[PDB]
Design a protein around this ligand. Structure first.
Ligand SMILES: O=C(NCCCOc1c(-c2ccc(O)c(O)c2)oc2cc(O)cc(O)c2c1=O)[C@@H]1CCCN1C(=O)/C=C/c1ccc(O)c(O)c1
Ligand SMILES: *[C@@H]1O[C@H](CO)[C@@H](O)[C@H](O)[C@H]1NC(C)=O
Ligand SMILES: [Ca+2]
Ligand SMILES: [Cl-]
Length: 496
């Protein structure tokens, strides 16, 4: 459950948040395969509540109605077509598995659902599964409201309703079996693994019992006996009783401290600075690297009041964001996930975005296609961070340097830092309010290297900055604090 099942030499996944299946299939073929991406985290592919007040928010997809593969992203045939096409070009699919809960207990009964299935939250009836009142934790939860009230009580966090979402009785073999039926349908289609949503809200042992029912990966594409990659969404910033280490026997965990702390450092909050990153990793209180799924932002916390609150860097903070993503992709800790977002009309009132619910770009509720512009950016309000040169080239950097040790660290005691990855890559950052002009030991073979942040190696030439490494491994780097991107990265495959 710990290995991503990507092709050798592909080291990241991208969250194509709210993308349609047909667009992901095309993206696999036209971009993700040639540019070395390992796989795609998809939005929940199972039927959810259609919420019209407010209008089709992103978060309706975290309110299941059934396990039919029928959503605003597409139907089952479209989902299978995507998985097949992506696997056929060596790009994996990871499903966001929403298995802790069904929909909100106060959602009105009827057929306001993405496949038109009937459901009745008040009577606990989800006949398209089927689930009934016997399948929820009403009787087990001990809080006066029936909802989670206090995160200092680890039992209610697991047995009570997260935000009122009907909480499945995951101790029951019937319920475990219905979830495994859904997950095995997906595995047999060809999915490579799962994000387990809301894992903090499930007992480690109930997750384990579900995972024990799962198949090995589809043997038309994967070696015999391959286990699905599992990454559990556990929001653990410290200071609560539940620790993500309780989940290590099941799979990896999301390390939300990673982006929270990286954001504070890059924003220079509370006296933090990039020189402190020399011991980034477990020295910062993080989980073991081999259990970490890392990211700068995710779909929830990029809206500003998730895990990390306002420290989280996002595409809205493009300059600092590229820096943070670059540091993450260069540094060996963790398995990396890159975010890919849509734009929405963010509107802060009293410090909070009142439009943080807005769903993906749409016409009358129908999600818009991703259009590709001649310059390789996206239209229709898709941000496509994973296509930004500075991010895509760092996805490739991570592939090139895979397995190489962290070495040749430099810092100026403030916010000018650099490090290498064995003899295969080197990266230099300037987040101070003055210039960084210095000769540094790079660990690389002598030669001329293209900076992959300011440009590309194309047709035996560099389109941006060139770095000259001498026989001693040293090279001069010059980065103004006014540079478009105040960091430079070079690697073995950017050498002329
Ligand atoms: O203000 C909201 N919710 C309360 C604060 C966020 O708490 C939630 C957490 C959450 C927050 C902090 C924690 O420490 C924690 O253990 C859990 O996880 C969820 C997971 C879901 O599948 C569905 C949800 O509705 C939630 C949720 O509401 C709005 C309105 C409804 C959805 N929502 C949201 O804000 C939706 C957020 C959301 C949705 C999916 C996620 O995976 C997620 O992490 C957050
Ligand atoms: C590199 O750029 C130079 C100058 O534009 C050009 O003469 C040369 O043909 C290009 N390609 C190589 C492989 O040198
Ligand atoms: Ca639960
Ligand atoms: Cl996540």
């Amino acid at each position: 459950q710990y290995s991503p099942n990507t092709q050798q030499g592909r080291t990241s996944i991208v969250h194509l948040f709210e993308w349609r299946w047909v667009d992901i299939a095309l993206e696999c073929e036209r971009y993700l395969a040639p540019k070395g991406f390992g796989g795609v985290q998809v939005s929940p592919p199972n039927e959810n509540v259609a919420i019209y007040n407010p209008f089709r928010p992103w978060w309706e997809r975290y309110q299941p109605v059934s396990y039919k593969l029928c959503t605003r992203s597409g139907n089952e045939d479209e989902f299978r077509n995507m998985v097949t096409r992506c696997n056929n070009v060596g790009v994996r699919i990871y499903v966001d598995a929403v298995i802790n809960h069904m929909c909100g207990n106060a959602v009105s009964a009827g057929t306001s659902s993405t496949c038109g299935s009937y459901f009745n939250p008040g009577s606990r009836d989800f006949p398209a599964v089927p689930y009934s009142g016997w399948d929820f934790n009403d009787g087990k939860c001990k809080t006066g409201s029936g909802d989670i009230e206090n995160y200092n009580d680890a039992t209610q966090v697991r047995d009570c309703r997260l935000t009122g979402l009907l909480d499945l009785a995951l101790e029951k073999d019937y319920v475990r079996s219905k979830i495994a039926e859904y997950m095995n349908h997906l595995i047999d289609i060809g999915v490579a693994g799962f994000r387990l949503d809301a894992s903090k809200h499930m007992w480690p042992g109930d997750i384990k019992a579900i995972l024990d029912k799962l198949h090995n990966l589809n043997s038309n594409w994967f070696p015999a006996g391959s286990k699905p990659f599992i990454y559990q969404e556990v929001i653990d910033l410290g200071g609560e009783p539940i620790k993500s280490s309780d989940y290590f026997g099941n799979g990896r965990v999301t390390e939300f401290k990673y982006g929270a702390k990286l954001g504070t450092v890059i924003r220079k909050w509370n006296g933090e600075k990039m020189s402190y990153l020399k011991n980034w990793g477990e020295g910062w209180g993080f989980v073991p690297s081999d259990r970490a799924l890392v990211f700068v932002d995710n779909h929830d916390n990029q809206r500003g009041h998730g895990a990390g609150g306002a420290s989280i860097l996002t595409f809205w903070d493009a300059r600092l964001y590229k820096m943070a993503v670059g540091f993450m992709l260069a540094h060996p800790y963790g398995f990396t996930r890159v975010m890919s977002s849509y734009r929405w009309p963010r509107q802060f009132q009293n410090g909070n975005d009142v439009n943080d619910w807005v769903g993906p770009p749409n016409n009358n509720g129908v999600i818009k296609e991703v259009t590709i512009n001649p310059d390789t950016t996206c239209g229709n309000d898709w941000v496509c961070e994973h296509r930004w040169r500075q991010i895509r080239n760092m996805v490739i950097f991570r592939n090139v340097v895979d397995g190489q040790p962290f070495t040749n660290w430099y810092d100026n005691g403030s916010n000018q830092v650099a490090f290498g990855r064995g003899n295969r890559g080197f990266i230099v950052f300037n987040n101070d309010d003055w210039s960084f002009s210095l000769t540094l030991q790079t660990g690389l073979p002598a030669g001329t290297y293209c900076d992959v942040i300011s440009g590309d190696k194309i047709n035996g030439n560099c389109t941006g900055i060139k770095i000259y490494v001498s026989d001693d491994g040293k090279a001069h780097f010059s980065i103004s604090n006014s540079a478009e991107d105040p960091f430079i990265a070079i690697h073995a495959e950017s050498k002329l």
